[PDB]
Nucleic acid binder design. Structure first.
Length: 290
DNA sequence: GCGACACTAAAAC
DNA sequence: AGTTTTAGTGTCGC
């Protein structure tokens, strides 16, 4: 009824079928590691502005809620939240050095203002994009919003347990405990150590995330989860690492920039999940029907 | 089969 | 030790 896998940090992922077993909403059994991500491709090379050295990049993503491994399928529920977290790493550059340096895209060099992640959902069979929505903890008593582009600096990905523990923190003392894991406060560095041109000082805000945390995410309520044949549709979640550049022949999305102008989120790397099944609102998807 | 509202159980404090 | 918060899902009404 419950199938258990040991996670990397010694927590468990407990996979169960909600058609057969109902578990409380806030049970720790709702937290579990989702499908592993795979490389789609690498896109634009990035080089350090004097040495010319190519920056090695790797997305480090994980799903921490919302998906169960059931009968060799990865299964989510339309009505329920998923969590997708990601960092990136630069294998050949330590953070402290990285932040003082400057980087160009090799396309013909465009200067990188900052690095960022975005997520997308797709129909895995035809590449059609599927809208995602997020809520705040207040859910219907707060706003709905689409996942945003998240400026980030390189960081190790927190353990599954850490994401769990930080999921609903409001208490100031506990927030302080996790602050260094999730944020870099640029306003607290010694500005004299940095050149005007440094990467750190072209990030758009002083509070810079170390981890992209997309919590309380759902597929848009309009999604059709079955094909006309009544076979399940296959979806996939995508994580894209980009460099944001000033717009003034390679894959990119336009971005609403800080100064107001029409920025450019130039793709660097993309990963995706294997195929995902999503169960809809049908009563037959819930143990209550049995 | 959707948005809204309701109920409820364990986490958070 | 009690009260509030959060989120899976049951239900209503178009």
């Amino acid at each position: 009824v419950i199938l258990t896998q040991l996670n990397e940090d010694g927590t468990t992922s407990n996979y169960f079928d909600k058609r057969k077993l109902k578990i409380a909403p806030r049970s720790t059994l709702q937290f579990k590691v989702g499908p592993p991500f795979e490389l789609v491709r690498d896109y634009c090379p990035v080089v350090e502005s004097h040495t010319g050295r190519t920056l090695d990049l790797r997305i480090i993503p994980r799903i921490d809620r919302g998906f169960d491994h059931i009968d060799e399928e990865w299964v989510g529920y339309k009505r329920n939240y998923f969590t997708l977290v990601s960092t990136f790493e630069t294998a050949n550059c330590d953070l402290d050095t990285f932040l003082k340096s400057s980087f160009d895209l090799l396309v013909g060099r465009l200067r990188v203002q900052y690095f960022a992640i975005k997520i997308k959902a797709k129909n895995d069979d035809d590449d059609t994009e599927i809208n995602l929505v997020q809520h705040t903890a207040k859910r219907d008593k707060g706003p709905q919003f689409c996942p945003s582009v998240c400026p980030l600096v390189p960081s190790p990905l927190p353990k599954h347990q850490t994401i769990r523990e930080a999921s609903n923190v409001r208490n100031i003392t506990k927030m302080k405990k996790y602050d260094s894991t999730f944020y870099l406060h640029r306003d607290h560095v010694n500005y004299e150590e940095y050149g005007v041109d440094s990467l750190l000082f072209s990030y758009p805000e002083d509070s810079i995330q170390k981890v992209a945390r997309y919590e309380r995410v759902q597929f848009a309520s309009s999604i059709s989860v079955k094909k006309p044949s009544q076979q399940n549709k296959h979806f996939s979640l995508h994580v894209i690492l980009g460099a944001v550049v000033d717009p003034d022949g390679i894959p990119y999305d336009e971005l609403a920039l800080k100064n107001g102008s029409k920025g450019m989120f130039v793709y660097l790397q993309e990963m995706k999940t294997p195929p995902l099944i999503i169960r809809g609102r049908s009563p037959s998807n819930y143990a209550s029907s049995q």
